[PDB]
């Protein structure tokens, strides 16, 4: 150690002599390497020997050309010993000064400052007159550093020099571009500005620690090799299925069928019918009034319909500018990538269901279950184990360094041998008491409850009370702080944590007290609620949330910085690329030729679009961007953004989850060693019949009870009870609005209800005599059954007595939907999931408390910002909103409402921040990203209470919706996931089992499949011993034969993507010939494997799969050709021809990368089956409720003639759509209608019900409860499948 020496020419002489001796006749130490801090054992730099030409301090470099420099920051630099460019000698005093500059932190600080101001200048949209010079010096600065580097080292000539690190390539390229387009007139600004953003990537090279984070991200994504292949394979096969099924069933439009031949005008004149133009004419369509795209339809019975005089045909162009389509393999792949990431998939769902029928919903189930629920979780699990490995490796390096510290310590220890104080203490006396702290906490809670009491329609009496309460509470808090600041020290003892926070809060409160209310007070009164976090010292879960939030801005800060830089770079790239196109082609997308709500003309809107596509909504902006800037560039940029940003966000989520796990605790502080003063405060407050059975009748009674128990336990009564339960539950499906058409079914069900309730009453009585009163009443299942049968008894005996029209009886009739809530205690699969959820429920309640109190702060923030500003005057006749020039406020709209002008209405947005209660619903809509569009559209138009909104008058309110998503929808999810994982881990620890959602009957099959998965293969093959001669036996066992068959299958797959809806007949004939050739080749293959190998056709199972797919191929190829005689069945050949994609599954044969993934899916199938059964039961119950309640609401927004609640099928479809939480806002707006909109009395032809209004309370409660239950069930499904994936991926054996 302690080796220091100037790089004198004799040092180079000996280095060259050593290398010459070595040549005439090995890993550098990772601790030393380069660009890191020096180990402590070498000491410190002597005097001013910093930036001196030291030599290399490690082996393996004694003979090679090297030269070492150090800085005052103690970092290692290794430049070359030879003069750079053979002209600049090291001792000629040109390179020495430049190296001294390069090793100075001030140089890096200056470069960072110029980089930040450069990107800030790139933020500006319009280049001002005083900007060119600002750019000029920037270039003059940048080349500066390059020159220094050029002086520092040569251009990749030999050894560790410039143009070796990729960042050297990056900045070399950026300066080359800058000086290419500096003074040269060549270069289009729209092409050079988008490349000018490359200076922002220099932040990673400048900011310390960013390069390691980027490398970690790339290493994490490195393992995504086989999962990507499986994802693309599944997407391809499902896209082939969709293309073969829905080929052209998206341009189906209803045109006026009766052709007015006498009035069929033409553009050139001379009349004429001119087909292929009569169908491309827009005016000969049907568009529902108030809508934009013409209505779709189908020729099937369950598909859509159009009015009289119209008829369906394939006409016009596909919906959504022709982008949403299934006519081509590329468009099908796009539309199914739209389904794997569930973004606006409800629109495609509705479009295909309307244009092809309601019986195709099964397809949309499969793609949801596999391809959108399994692939995403596969990717998440892969990233999770990658991050686990990275975290483990980092821990190993850390503990290795700490262990070498022990050896270093051993070595060093071996080598060692005016009455101010009176009032100070007096004001202190009222500090160290539990009472004052408890009073402070109670004051904070009461302040929160008082702030939650404000609403838009408030009377002066209420606001006076609120104002005086706010004044007194501010006074109390400022008195507490004021007393605290004198007790310890007027200018000291205020930096021990939580004493600067409350000081900041109280100072803001006092500043708010002054300055009156000129401007900005609405947001100013929104920073005091942070006193809620003062409860974190007593709330462990709130403290954990605070720790999670602080981890992002803290130890895990470089990841957040990288995410911010990535978002900014993508925003500026998009803004510079498509900024001008949105104005040139403004009404290519918006008929008014005014810029739409989501454009890319300025930096703020581009950043909003980037944040939106990060949230998950990207197709809607992609279509608009495509319509103005082409498809290629827009697709490339949107794909890149949605991949990279999502990957970074996922990595940050996983990192925060890992930091929240117990690895954060290192026993630095004692586990709750301190004592909570509340206990001592409470202590000091306190200080100052029974007959026998062994008789003639008792024995008989005992046998009676024992036989009742035996009847209960007999597994023939239970099956009959389950069958009766299924029949009773299914009898509730025939209660749609079409019940008047089927009178006989109604009568039969009405009379069978009596039999069902008698059966259940007898079962309850026999169970009572069997189990006993205490055993029957000491469990939840029998109590629930008793409640159900008791409500049935009430609804039966009351109805028999009378009062069938009573409000109470009618409101108890709809409670009959709880009859399906009786198979939970019978099916073990449902019961195990239900009881696991019940056992875990305390943790979700504890975290829901924190989530609610956190969301209350944001709800109060919104209420104090958007109270009563959502009202707007509306003209129903023209369905347009009045501008600020027509009407200004409510008074002007009222004046416009004079006389009989009922068309003018002072309408209000249904979802608004008028109070905390509605603010909670608005926050729920925003957090789930469903229905938030209208909320932020109305928020940015708001000006002040009681005045008509102006288009984009409060554009900077979007930030309020961004921050919430960062805090209420991102970190709260981290808390929920962490607590769920911890609770499930503890449940597994205490149970001692292997799986939670599995019954004991499924565990044996689980273990059997586990043994099957690890089974080794054997290949015993005998000779045919016949006239086969074994030549074909050796042929089939040839790898070339398998390669040929695989390549032929791949060619079949490739030629199965060329089919197009608008293809010519010649192309159809060519494709038919090619498919026939492939089919006959496959039949020849089957013949070859036939009659040459038979004794192995019941063991492997692949051969029988080929045999069962081939026969389907011949039938679907030639029988389908035959069926045209005496049979039509138009839709059946497509289903049969779907079997052709079976041969595509033969690529799984050699798929060892993804075969294990498919095996993991098989392994996790039953645990998913139990949860799916429970979800289906919940869906059935909520569907019965929806039929009973919302079967007559007005057809508006998501409620239409095809997706609504009258029939069981329609309700089932709507609830399955809501299960993924897709567009539940659209199905909630019609319920929220009011008598001004919906008629209280309305004739319903065919039924006795009157009116088309709904109960807002019932609808809100229904949808919220369904959302909560579906979220819990889907979370459990994700946890189960991810655990099974980890278990499968954590296995390895010889």
């Amino acid at each position: 150690p302690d080796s220091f020496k100037p790089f004198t020419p004799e040092s180079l002489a000996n280095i060259e002599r050593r290398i010459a001796e070595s040549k005439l006749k090995p890993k550098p130490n990772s601790d030393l390497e380069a660009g890191k801090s020096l180990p402590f054992i070498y000491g410190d730099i002597p005097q001013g020997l910093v930036a001196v030409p030291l030599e290399d301090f490690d082996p393996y470099y004694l003979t090679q050309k090297t030269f070492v420099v150090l800085n005052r920051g103690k970092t290692l630099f290794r430049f070359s010993a030879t003069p750079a460019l053979y002209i600049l000698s090291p001792f000629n005093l040109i390179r020495r000064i430049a190296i001294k500059i390069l090793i100075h932190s001030v140089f890096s600080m200056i470069i960072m400052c110029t980089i930040l101001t450069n990107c800030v200048f790139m933020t500006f949209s319009n280049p001002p007159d005083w900007s060119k010079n600002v750019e000029y010096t920037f270039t003059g600065i940048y080349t500066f550093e390059s020159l220094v580097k050029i002086i520092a080292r040569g251009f990749c000539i030999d050894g560790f020099t410039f143009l070796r690190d990729p960042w050297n390539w990056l900045d070399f390229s950026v300066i080359m571009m800058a000086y290419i387009t500096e003074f040269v007139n060549l270069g289009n600004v729209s092409a050079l500005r988008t490349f000018r953003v490359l200076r922002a990537l220099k932040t990673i090279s400048v900011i310390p620690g960013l390069k390691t984070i980027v490398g970690a991200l790339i290493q994490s994504v490195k393992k995504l090799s086989d999962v990507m292949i499986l994802t693309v394979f599944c997407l391809s096969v499902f896209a082939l299925i969709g293309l073969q099924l829905f080929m052209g069933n998206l341009r189906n439009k209803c045109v006026v069928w009766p052709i007015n031949f006498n009035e069929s005008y033409l553009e050139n004149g001379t009349k004429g019918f001119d087909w292929e133009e009569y169908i491309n004419n827009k005016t000969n369509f049907y568009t529902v009034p108030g809508m934009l795209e013409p209505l779709l339809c189908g020729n099937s019975s369950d598909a859509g319909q159009c009015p009289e005089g119209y008829q369906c045909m394939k006409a016009g162009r596909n919906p959504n500018y022709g982008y949403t389509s299934f006519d081509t393999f590329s468009w099908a792949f796009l539309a199914l990538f739209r389904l794997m990431t569930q973004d606006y998939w409800e629109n495609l769902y509705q479009l295909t269901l309307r244009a092809a029928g309601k019986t195709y919903m099964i397809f949309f189930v499969l793609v949801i279950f596999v391809g959108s629920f399994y692939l995403v979780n596969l990717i998440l699990a892969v990233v999770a184990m990658a991050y686990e490995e990275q975290n483990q490796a980092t821990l190993e390096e850390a503990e290795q360094k700490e262990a070498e510290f022990k050896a270093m310590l051993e070595q060093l220890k071996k080598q060692q041998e005016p009455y101010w104080i009176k009032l100070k203490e007096i004001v202190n006396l009222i500090v160290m008491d539990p009472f004052v702290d408890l009073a402070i906490t109670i004051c904070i809670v009461l302040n929160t409850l008082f702030m939650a009491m404000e609403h838009h329609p408030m009377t002066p009496q209420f606001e006076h009370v609120l104002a005086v309460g706010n004044l007194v509470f501010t006074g109390i808090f400022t008195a507490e702080m004021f007393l605290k600041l004198i007790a310890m020290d007027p200018y000291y003892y205020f930096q021990e944590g939580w004493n600067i926070f409350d000081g900041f809060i109280v100072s803001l409160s006092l500043m708010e007290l002054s300055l009156a209310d000129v401007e900005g007070l609405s947001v100013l009164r929104s920073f005091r609620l942070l006193r809620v976090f003062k409860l974190a010292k007593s709330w462990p879960t709130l403290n954990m949330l605070i720790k999670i939030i602080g981890n992002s801005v803290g130890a895990l800060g470089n990841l957040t910085l990288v995410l911010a830089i990535i978002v900014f770079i993508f925003a500026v790239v998009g803004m510079q690329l498509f900024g001008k196109s949105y104005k040139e082609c403004v009404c290519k997308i918006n008929q008014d030729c005014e810029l739409p709500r989501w454009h890319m003309h300025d930096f703020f809107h581009s950043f909003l679009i980037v944040f939106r596509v990060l949230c998950g909504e990207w197709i809607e902006t992609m279509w608009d961007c495509m319509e103005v800037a082409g498809q290629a560039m827009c697709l490339i940029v949107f794909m890149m953004v949605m991949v990279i940003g999502n990957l970074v966000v996922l990595n940050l989520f996983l990192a925060l989850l890992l930091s929240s796990f117990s690895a954060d605790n290192l026993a630095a502080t004692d586990d709750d060693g301190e004592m909570n003063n509340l206990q001592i405060s409470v202590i000091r407050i306190k200080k100052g019949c029974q007959v026998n059975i062994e008789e003639g009748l008792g024995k008989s009674w005992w046998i009676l009870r024992k036989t009742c128990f035996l009847i209960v336990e007999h597994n023939w009564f239970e099956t009959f009870i389950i069958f009766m339960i299924l029949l009773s539950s299914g009898a509730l499906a025939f209660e749609d609005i079409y019940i008047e058409q089927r009178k006989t079914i109604r009568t039969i069900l009405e009379y069978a209800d009596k039999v069902f309730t008698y059966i259940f009453i007898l079962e309850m009585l026999l169970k009572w005599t069997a189990y006993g009163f205490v055993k029957f009443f000491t469990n939840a299942w029998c109590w629930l059954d008793f409640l159900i049968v008791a409500v049935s008894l009430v609804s039966l005996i009351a109805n028999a007595l009378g009062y069938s029209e009573l409000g109470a009886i009618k409101s108890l009739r709809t409670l009959r939907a709880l009859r399906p809530l009786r198979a939970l205690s019978r099916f073990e699969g449902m019961r195990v999931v239900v009881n696991a959820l019940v056992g875990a429920i305390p943790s979700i309640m504890n975290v829901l408390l924190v989530c609610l109190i956190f969301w209350l702060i944001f709800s109060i923030m919104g209420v104090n910002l958007f109270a009563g500003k959502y009202h707007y005057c509306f003209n129903e006749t023209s369905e347009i909103r009045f501008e600020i020039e027509d009407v200004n406020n409510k008074t002007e709209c009222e004046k416009l409402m004079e006389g009989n002008n009922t068309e003018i209405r002072w309408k209000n947005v249904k979802i608004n921040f008028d109070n905390v209660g509605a603010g909670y619903l608005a926050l729920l809509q925003v957090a789930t990203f469903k229905g938030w569009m209208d909320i932020m559209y109305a928020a940015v138009d708001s000006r002040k209470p009681d005045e008509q909104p102006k288009y984009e008058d409060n554009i900077y309110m979007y930030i309020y919706f961004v921050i919430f998503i960062i805090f209420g929808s991102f970190f709260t999810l981290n808390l929920f996931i962490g607590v769920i994982i911890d609770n499930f881990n503890q449940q597994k620890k205490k149970f001692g089992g292997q799986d939670i959602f599995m019954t004991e009957e499924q565990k044996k099959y689980y273990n059997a499949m586990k043994k099957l998965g690890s089974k080794k293969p054997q290949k015993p093959i005998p000779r045919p011993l016949n006239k086969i001669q074994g030549i074909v036996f050796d042929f089939v066992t040839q790898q070339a034969f398998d390669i040929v068959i695989m390549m032929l299958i791949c060619l079949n797959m490739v030629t199965m993507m060329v089919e197009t809806d608008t293809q010519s007949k010649q192309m159809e004939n060519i494709l038919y010939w090619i498919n026939l050739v492939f089919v006959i080749f496959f039949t020849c293959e089957c013949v070859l494997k036939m009659f040459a190998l038979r004794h192995y056709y019941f063991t492997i199972g692949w051969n029988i799969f080929d045999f069962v797919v081939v026969i389907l191929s011949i039938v679907g190829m030639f029988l389908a050709d035959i069926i045209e005689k005496y049979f039509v069945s138009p839709t059946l050949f497509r289903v049969i021809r779907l079997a052709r994609i079976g041969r595509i599954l033969r690529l799984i044969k050699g798929a060892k990368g993804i075969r294990t993934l498919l095996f993991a899916l098989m392994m996790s199938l039953p645990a998913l089956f139990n949860i799916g059964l429970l979800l289906f039961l919940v869906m059935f119950i909520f569907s019965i409720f929806g039929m009973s309640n919302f079967a007559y609401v007005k057809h508006e927004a998501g409620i239409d003639d095809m997706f609504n609640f009258e029939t069981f099928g329609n309700s089932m479809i709507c609830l399955f759509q809501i299960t993924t939480s897709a567009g539940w806002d659209g199905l909630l707006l019609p319920i929220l209608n009011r008598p001004p909109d919906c008629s209280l009395d309305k004739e319903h032809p065919g039924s006795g019900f009157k009116g088309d209004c709904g109960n807002p309370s019932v609808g809100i409660f229904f949808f919220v409860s369904y959302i909560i239950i579906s979220f819990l069930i889907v979370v459990n499904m994700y946890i189960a499948i991810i655990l099974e994936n980890f278990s499968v991926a954590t296995e390895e054996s010889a």
Binding site: V256, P258, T283, Y286, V288, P289, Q305, C306, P307, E308, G309, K699, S700, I703, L704, K706, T707, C708, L710, I711, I737, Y738, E740, Q741, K743, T744, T747, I748, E750, Y751, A752, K754, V755, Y758, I759, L762, L766, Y1192, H1195, D1201, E1243, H1244, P1245, G1246, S1247, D1252
Partner: protein, 173 residues
């Protein structure tokens, strides 16, 4: 928001009735102008005769000694867009036992389009002195009683069997 139902064939003598003629359009959101006519052919007679005509929210009743004073409109009200064309008769006699044809004429107004639609609904009305309960109710009643009693006897028989078996086993040991 419509269910096409069918009127009841049997009509009791001496009391009121309701002849249903419901014909709603294929799409509810559309608007139209609709008016109806009714033709009645008594049994034995072979010619349909117009009895009433509803249009412009008014009802015209032709001269017919069997129908004046004993028929009122009972369809959709308050609009020209008619989907319920039912009529209410306040006194059923033996004359009102024949075949009714409900001719509904609808004119649908689209944008630069007007479509003419005519629908004919056929109703058979039988006049009886007393109302006979439908066979479905009787069959359902008998079946529900039969299943109730057979289930009761099966349950008590199984209970008796198990009672005897368990009592014998207990007495044996």
């Amino acid at each position: 928001g419509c269910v096409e139902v069918d009127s009841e064939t049997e009509a009791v003598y001496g009391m009121t009735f309701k002849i249903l003629c419901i014909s709603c359009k294929r799409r509810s959101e559309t608007n139209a102008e609709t008016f109806t006519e009714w033709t009645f052919r008594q049994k034995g007679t072979e010619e349909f005769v117009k009895i009433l005509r509803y249009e412009n929210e008014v009802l015209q009743l032709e001269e017919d000694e069997r129908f004046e004073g004993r028929v009122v409109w009972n369809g959709s009200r308050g609009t020209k867009d008619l989907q319920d064309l039912s009529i209410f008769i306040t006194n059923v006699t033996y004359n009102h036992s024949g075949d009714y044809e409900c001719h509904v004429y609808r004119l649908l107004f689209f944008e630069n389009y007007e479509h003419n639609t005519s629908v004919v609904k056929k109703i058979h009305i039988e006049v009886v002195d007393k109302a006979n309960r439908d066979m479905a109710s009787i069959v359902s009643e008998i079946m529900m009683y039969v299943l109730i009693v057979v289930l009761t006897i099966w349950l008590v028989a199984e209970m008796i069997y198990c009672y005897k078996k368990i009592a014998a086993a207990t007495e044996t040991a």
